[PDB]
């Protein structure tokens, strides 16, 4: 009867999983670990709509909040995921206030936005739903370009979104650096600390994508509200590489 | 050109294999590209149906590993359809008798050596029109030893000509011996039974394999002379990796 | 060799089904009932493209006209559904004449629109096709916002569309009311009667989404050209609730 | 924590279950959230293959009902894969003999009580590491009685320890008795046979269930003391609901 | 209204059928709309699982041809599920004995003539409430002859009342006779065996069919009096068509 | 370790296949023939994202370059296909320089474009990837409208795209002619020869869709850099029609 991430915030940060691999079984198993949410990546993965739909059900059963990082900031895409029981939306490449308004417009019924009414899965979870519907959903605009960085105060002024979510590898690449996992490039570190500073100054939430528990520990200690660690494919490949090395030793 | 596990065996060396309980092509290619000689797809304990296994075999083959399937059951017609989909290794669960081992062998070879139906959709693309002459050599076939019955019938199972050897299911074997179904068990009777099966396989000039839950245990099985070592299931490795990332983050 | 809904109109209103549930078996069974068309909802459902494709085939075999209510008024989405054998398109959230022109542009080959030529399934049904292709397809713009209501005459002036299709729950919500199934909110009833009046005055068709046979009876008697009743999920849940009550009595 | 049908049975009360012939997760969750104790997915007469059943079981479990499967056939390895996918009830069609009932029982219990293969992917997530000790109790198993053969062999079918009891297939039973395959039949011989099967089940201290086409007929079966009543198939309820909406609209 | 192959047979004429090894609905409808009386979906040698066959049957029926399935195996419960999905013809591979032919026949007919389970989801939509009375006539059933065993047992296979006749698997038959598994073979012993099977089928008042790789070979089989001729697999026709387009382009 | 089509060009034209039918088996078999690339059509087919993903893997294994003709010139669609191992993109209905810039922006990382970084499948193929990533991908803008024809020099001036790809049936239809397969309509033939002339004058590649080996032979002899022949459905239907005619003779 509550968004698990919003419950954290009403008390603390949320730690979230991150899925690049389609399917229900790992999604349920990771949801039952000490993750507050699990994010399904529809941008940089083979996950289409038909594949994401049962994964959202698997995450909720595991007892974590089902989040989707979308392919694009498209209102109608975002609406169909909310009606399929995505209760968190991370939209990539939100570069301007107008783009942040487009995201906010998808997350709220009229009068606060233009979300189309047909809440197939949320009406089953919440039963009462319409009266609390905006609170059931967390919305974060991705900051991952020099343009998004310049427009940070503009983007954070948008009511309807909870805050921003840093894509550090795309931010590093767009600033002319190596697209390093958990990049500590001094200019990129500066930009990230600036985004976190401006989000907290406007009374908004800030999140960040991490490639490691180590990096995620530091981001939590830095006061980020929403930390993801680490992609299922990345954790699985590293574990298999270590299992093989130990076998062949 | 060649079955990469048989190439290992021919050059005097064991094969190390991955083990997939998670459906999908991306991790199947990613793990195939690691220093695994083969990758086994589990169709027994997992949600992987035939529709989901077919593209996974392609993805493993592209990554450079030999695609294997541990079937739901020792059923000839299920096995033949997987061979024709480009499964180049078959591991059949719960092979308890000489008769069941012969049923497996029958699926793996064309007439006159078995009764495999001819329609090799994917193997004819890989091997070309010369496929029939070398078909038997392109496929590796292992009967699973997971029961007291199979342990008692090991010598007669090992006498069947059309299987390469046996593959220990150590959690089922531990359970059927009255012990905890723990992977990589130290239980003396289970350890004894596993050593017994390897010794009998090697005495009969056949291959022996074993399912492992860890790199450390796989290292020992490789040093003991196991021909085909699997380590470790994608879901188990992923789950353990996530619990550690969470522990480090919190 | 004809659009079953257009045949009704050339003689009478069309009564249509409405699917929120993916799959072929219920789609064929409902198509064989006394429905002129069956609408597949790709907005407020788990139905992706791969799932809709075989449902269109199942509806045609049942002998009803296959319709799709799309996720969004996107030309290229609409074109791919027409080439998969959708012979009716209902586009949601058509708020302006420009948006109604975008819908019209997808439904017609040049010179009447810009529909891309590759009619995989219609060429199999019609064999002759190009010469009649516009007549094989029914197009309706959804009116479900106060903006769409204000622009009704603008939207109805667009050649290329057959008419409009009322979304009464979204219209009620956007006008500041409860999103009630078959809403009789006096302001919403007024707006709907106005839309029907203006559609018939411009010589265009008007349709309406209904949640019940009762409401659909009244809309047919009011002279609506295209009436849908009722969602498969809604009919199934209500039937199961009554079966359980009778079992437990 | 517990199988909701067994909890009903333990607290002295019958179970009412839904019946799905339509694949997909949305209606499966919607019906599971109604006052049904279980929801049965039909894999015999429907287009539901293994790939389509797997997410449906998840969706029923989330809705709060016990996920059941009426299998295509009484096949041990098919049954074991469904158990490992989180099917917590099994209804096996066309169980005609004590031997076939024993084949069903064998699939449902780990050694030493049956021969179920150990790899409980979804049950180990629900039940945790204590699963092995309580596995048998987490699963409900019913043998279907749908033939004159099964009716003649009812007492020997009911003597098998590893099944909870029987589930009447009344359209097949009516047909095999030489009568119209009508659901909720008034045909005196079919009615007699159904009462006979319930009385024998209850005399043997086993459960009895029946497939129903209507709420009214289900009410009577519940009053007659049936332990497990299904009412009614999603496609039948949907079809009847659409014909009435159409009738009212026109 | 009627099975289009049986309508051919009743009007004194053979049936020509297509043969699909490629999953999907678009080519299945496109080929069904050509001058084919039936289209066979191959579930033995192809990547077509149950989930992929179900919409293909719909697509063939819409195109105007009778939907047929060559099953993976002669398994009654697999056959019954395909009948209930709107497969109106069944071709069972590797039918070697009278007993196996009786197993096929049992799947195809309701009690009292066979043991087919009653739940005809798609046939009841096509045929209506009068389906039970005419069910047997709506389905065509052929046992495949592809082994020396089946050739020796042809007369006893042909004595089974509940199958329409036999369907030659000529590549498997050539292989089992010790010859190259070439389609449309000129090998004298294979040609002789094929003529022998047709003559025995026709002497027993049953139908005979044959799988062909070419239009030219199909023409000859039609002139020889084959009742059911398939020509030629979608993948083979597509592959040959692409090699010619490439040859012409380069 | 190279794009097979780019290798042709660095030496010769590329001949490519064209798939309208979903599935891996024909995709692998056609890839192993003497095709340099195989194009999967997501515009005029039942192929959704979940269906295209394994087909790309099947084509690469066969040893041809996996290409996709997209439903639409949508950056985020194009990015998700590149991260799934599409190494050629043909975007339909590219009518203006701005539209050609939108295509170019999807194909290149910053600073040359805005491609989002998460190369799941290319990182597995190339291992080194980022340093050569633009060279691994071929991009072609479709010319199939009178507007695209008028703007040809504009479109060809865009850096980031390799060239253009002619859709002759849509070009014929938009110019007021019959949408004939391999059309030789004199005005359409003129327009095509003009597009080829202007592409080669700007030092860019030109490709063309063919319905036959005969037409494709002539286009190769005319100096087209990228020739497709012929759709799998079209080749299969024609072969089946000839097999039936020979059987019934
Ligand atoms: Mg990013
Ligand atoms: Mg085992
Ligand atoms: Mg609406
Ligand atoms: Mg029955
Ligand atoms: Mg054969
Ligand atoms: Mg075009």
Numbering used by the authors:
A (entry chain B), C (entry chain B), F (entry chain B): 0 to 10, 12 to 127, 129 to 250
B (entry chain A), D (entry chain A), E (entry chain A): 0 to 249
Publication excerpt:
Here structural analysis of hydroxyketoacid aldolase from Sphingomonas wittichii RW1 (SwHKA) revealed a dynamic movement of the metal cofactor between two coordination spheres without protein scaffold rearrangements. Holo‐SwHKA forms a trimer of homodimers, in which each monomer adopts an (α/β)8 triosephosphate isomerase (TIM) barrel fold. The transition from M2+ R to M2+ A,S is induced by bidentate substrate binding and occurs without a concomitant rearrangement of the protein scaffold.
To investigate a potential structural role for the metal cofactor in the M2+ R configuration through interactions with residue S116′, two different variants were designed at this position. Identical orientations of the alanine/serine residues were observed, and the protein fold was unaffected by the mutation (rmsd=0.115 Å between 230 Cα atoms).
